[PDB]
C-alpha cells in the first residue's frame, strides 16, 4: 500500500479495512448460520460477542486460545484498539514493524 499506508501508520489513523481484535484473553467459539456470522471469545467469567460481516476472513478457528489482543479477521489493526487491548510496548512494535513493511 506503499506511502498511505506510511502516512495511515504515522497519523495513526484507524484504516478502512480494519482486522477485528479481541479485547480479552479466552477461548474461540465461532456461531456461523448461513446468513449471520460472529465469534465469541469466552473466559471463565466473561464472554465477547464479536459480530462481524459474513465475508470476513478468520484468522482464528474454532476452539483456538487468543491473547488480549490478537487479530481474529484479516486486516490493519486499528493502532488505538491494539493500545487498549495490549499495551505501549505492543502498539510500537506493531508500528515499527508495519512501517518497515513498506
Known amino acids: 500500500q506503499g506511502l498511505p499506508r506510511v502516512i495511515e501508520l ?3 489513523r484507524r484504516p ?11 477461548v474461540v467459539r465461532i456461531e456461523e448460520t448461513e446468513e449471520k456470522l460472529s465469534v465469541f471469545v469466552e473466559s471463565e467469567g466473561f464472554s465477547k460477542e464479536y459480530k462481524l460481516p459474513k465475508e470476513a ?7 483456538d486460545y487468543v491473547e488480549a489482543g ?29 512501517i518497515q513493511k513498506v
Open 16 to 26: 478502512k479495512a480494519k482486522a477485528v481484535i479481541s479485547e480479552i484473553d479466552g
Open 57 to 63: 476472513r478468520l484468522l482464528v478457528k474454532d476452539g
Open 70 to 98: 490478537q487479530p481474529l479477521t484479516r486486516g490493519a489493526i486499528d493502532p488505538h484498539q491494539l493500545l487498549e487491548a495490549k499495551g505501549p510496548e505492543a502498539v510500537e512494535r506493531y508500528l515499527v514493524e508495519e
Open 10 to 12: 504515522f497519523e495513526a
